[PDB]
Amino acid sequence: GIDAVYPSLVGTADSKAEGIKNYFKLSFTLPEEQKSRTVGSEAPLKDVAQALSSRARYELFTEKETANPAFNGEVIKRYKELMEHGEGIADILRSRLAKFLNTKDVGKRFAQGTEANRWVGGKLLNIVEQDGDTFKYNEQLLQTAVLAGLQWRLTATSNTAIKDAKDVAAITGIDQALLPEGLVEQFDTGMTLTEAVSSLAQKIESYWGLSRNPNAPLGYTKGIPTAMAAEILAAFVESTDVVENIVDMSEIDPDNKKTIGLYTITELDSFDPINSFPTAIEEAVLVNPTEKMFFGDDIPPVANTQLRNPAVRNTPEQKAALKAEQATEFYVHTPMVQFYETLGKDRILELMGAGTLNKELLNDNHAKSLEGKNRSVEDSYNQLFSVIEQVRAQSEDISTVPIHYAYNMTRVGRMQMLGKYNPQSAKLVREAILPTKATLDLSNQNNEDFSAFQLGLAQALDIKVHTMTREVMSDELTKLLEGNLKPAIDMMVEFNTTGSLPENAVDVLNTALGDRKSFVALMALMEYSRYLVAEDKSAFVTPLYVEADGVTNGPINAMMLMTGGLFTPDWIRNIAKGGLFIGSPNKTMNEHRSTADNNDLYQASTNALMESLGKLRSNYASNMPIQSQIDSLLSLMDLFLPDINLGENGALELKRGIAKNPLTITIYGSGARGIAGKLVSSVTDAIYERMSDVLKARAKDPNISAAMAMFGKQAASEAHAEELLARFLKDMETLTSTVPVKRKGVLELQSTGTGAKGKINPKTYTIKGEQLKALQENMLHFFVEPLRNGITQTVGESLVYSTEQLQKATQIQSVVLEDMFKQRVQEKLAEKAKDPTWKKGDFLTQKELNDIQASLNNLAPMIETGSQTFYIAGSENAEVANQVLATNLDDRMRVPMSIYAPAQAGVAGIPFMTIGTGDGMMMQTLSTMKGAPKNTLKIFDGMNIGLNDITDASRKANEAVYTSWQGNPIKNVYESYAKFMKNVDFSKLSPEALEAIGKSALEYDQRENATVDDIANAASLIERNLRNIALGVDIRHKVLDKVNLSIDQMAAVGAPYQNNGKIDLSNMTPEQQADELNKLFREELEARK
DNA sequence: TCAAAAGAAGCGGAGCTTC
């Protein structure tokens, strides 16, 4: 079969033969059902080029009757030029093989018997054929691989993952808090070797259309395609389709020896016809294209497995979730597209980005951040227009072309729309392609329709819609439309009348919006002005939406899901700030915020921080030098952060804002040091920006006061702008030269001998490493520490205990799985080494890996809820194989061998379960529950709803929130950890893993003098802890369900979900409610007893 | 801290080494 297709390859397809053995045929086999239309073709480049030569030829080749209408003349012409370029890549490749065969007589040595086809750099020799006194590529495999390479070149960038700080830190080996400025931007805008080759390899093997033989070594099944990828990547470097950049980390940190390769794909012109249809190749080659747009009733198929987690199948309920979301039709809203278009890319960059930095006369570091904001917008813009260019071809009226999007479930159970730039992920696109729409009767402003319309406009305009009633927001929206926004409204009216914009459109918009500016705000100004000129106001069609938005969702979900003790009154008040109201029939978040408590969970945190902060000062009341450090750190923040306000007499006031991100990531398991670095970065980002202001201040006057140029705004006078300049230089002084150190459980100031000193240069200015670290330590001990205590005091110690036990449990388990998998890989390799057909370079077969994985089932690597499946340890590390998989023909581009294997979890257990059983389970529920809202856009912790169904959809959302609150993540972990605890043997563990386990289950002291039996007893103690917590959470949930509850967590609209609790707890203080709930609690315990 | 990983290259044909 396979030999009949490739009968001329070099070698014998028998692992037991003595001479050259051909590992291509030994590792692959023809599939049952055709996957690629090139297998069997003696020249895929020519055949595919012919197939692309005309719509008629295309249709026949793909055995389809009609072809994408986007496949017209211009596109056809661009694809002809691209095919000719494919021949260029092919020629480069053929020439590289020849050079490889000549150097060090590899070719001659290979023909004489040297098994060079097994070297990390010669696996491609498995696809060559004998030709005279040398070898040559098999044209079918080569060309097909080139076709794969062309598709990848056209759409790889758009499919890349977004790299945050964590990623960059892991890649570069530089602490996340110390990354220079545009470093993250530089690495997010390029691909690492692994990222490039991996996606390229996947594409190549896919186009080859064969199947992996389960009994073939991974070194070949994965190696041959990866080796082909490396060569194609090298070829693209030679052709300049791809730019390679070797980043030397020794400059950005003299101690780092890592030199990292970065790969960027030369972008095509935004107006290139290929963009209107960049999947023509993919769609001709693959019978089941996994890269295309979905129009009409061409619905996306349902992913069978969790994203990048083949070991986990999407449960039946999750599959139903995906199906519902993928069936939703999205539509282009022409007015917005025409607006973006009339404004133009350049002006949207000015308006929503940094618009033209050409005046490269602004702080060097600030300039790198501004450049990043521009990129995100620009790429976002071109991607939106490439999409409408294809849509446009589908029909005469682009507003009526239905659009479907593929989705998939992630590790933490979220339904992520696939693709970097889409409605779910890109704000710019979100306002252009919507699933929402409604026909409203706005003829009377007393109608409910108008009231929904106002809600939509107000929320888009940044009015805190969930903090007031419809009525009150109705007045606030009006005062704004007729106020600061009127000039922008009038302009939009003209735009929706003649199609033109003034020359000062950016200024009119920027001035009318102020900090309310955003893409959704542009939609609001657009929709209101459309309504104004509308002929028939009684039937206004708009995609404008209202989002049922979760209030402090993550922290509230955690409190609700993992608090496991008796009920507390602080807890009852605090949980009310998240939508759970006890004894208040039909109460809404709007009434709660305006009538009972105007402070949300972020504020409560900030207020607890302020108290814990004042407390810190007392413990050092006399220590003048410490008081001054705190005061200086507080002074620096007040100088640049809006959330801090030191006032005249010293009154310290804080906004809920400074606790937003920290409260959130502390729920995702973040450490204190990490939070501190985030805050520092905020400060520095603002300083760098103020440095640009100064530059721009003296360019506007060469004599402006240094102080006046930097604080002319914040100040009210001269000597005043001098007081601020005095605080700055002094704050940067004490903060970079002196840092707090915790000794004997007490704080002590220590000099760094690396303080900031010298004449400030507003353009070169930069807060370096040793100075960033200093700010970091001050921020850590004088702000974050008290903030962390405040957070804990707010969410509850009980919840913190649960997350600790959860982390510990999931960690310990991840360790064993990891150590065991690694060991059993070492045992098998130990056998293979005794086999004459095997070689040190080959790894194990997929079968041998599937067996090793199976040998771990009894350790319960999976966590089940009944509707969701989690595999916390799952990952793709290079640690298991610990070896190169393949290199290019120049002995470079050495790609490490990655294997799907369990790894240490760290704190990952927390985010996985809180997100998974929290917002993950909720949205899943919301899209599959009886009467599931239709035509919405779900973004994890919020849902966009068309103006016509905001009431019922919001209520269903709150109901979904309620059923997700019936979850018990700890219980699920208990179930898994308990099975694990009865099959694990801590003596089979290396001292390495045995030590990590001790860290989680044993208190620092007992670690050294700890036997296997010691950590086994402790680990066993953790089982009981979880068992107890799970039992508590379960009682609370049942008890809480017997009382009358009103839930409005997905606030905005004011449609709370009523649980019909029979027991009435109205007319009671939280204290009374706690005692009553505990009576039902103790009572329920007895029941079980 | 979750969402996905992750250094390059001589000599020799793996994996130690130096930057």
UniProtKB/Swiss-Prot annotation:
ATP binds at K427, L428, V429, R430, D549, G550, V551, T552, N553, G554, K660, N661. Mg(2+) binds at D549, D941. It is found in: Virion. DNA-dependent RNA polymerase, which is injected into the host upon infection and transcribes the phage early genes from promoters that have a 5-bp stem-3 nt loop hairpin structure. Contains three functional domains; the central domain possesses the transcriptional activity. Belongs to the phage and mitochondrial RNA polymerase family. This is Virion DNA-directed RNA polymerase. It comes from Enterobacteria phage N4 (Bacteriophage N4). The lineage of its organism: Viruses, Duplodnaviria, Heunggongvirae, Uroviricota, Caudoviricetes. The gene is 50.
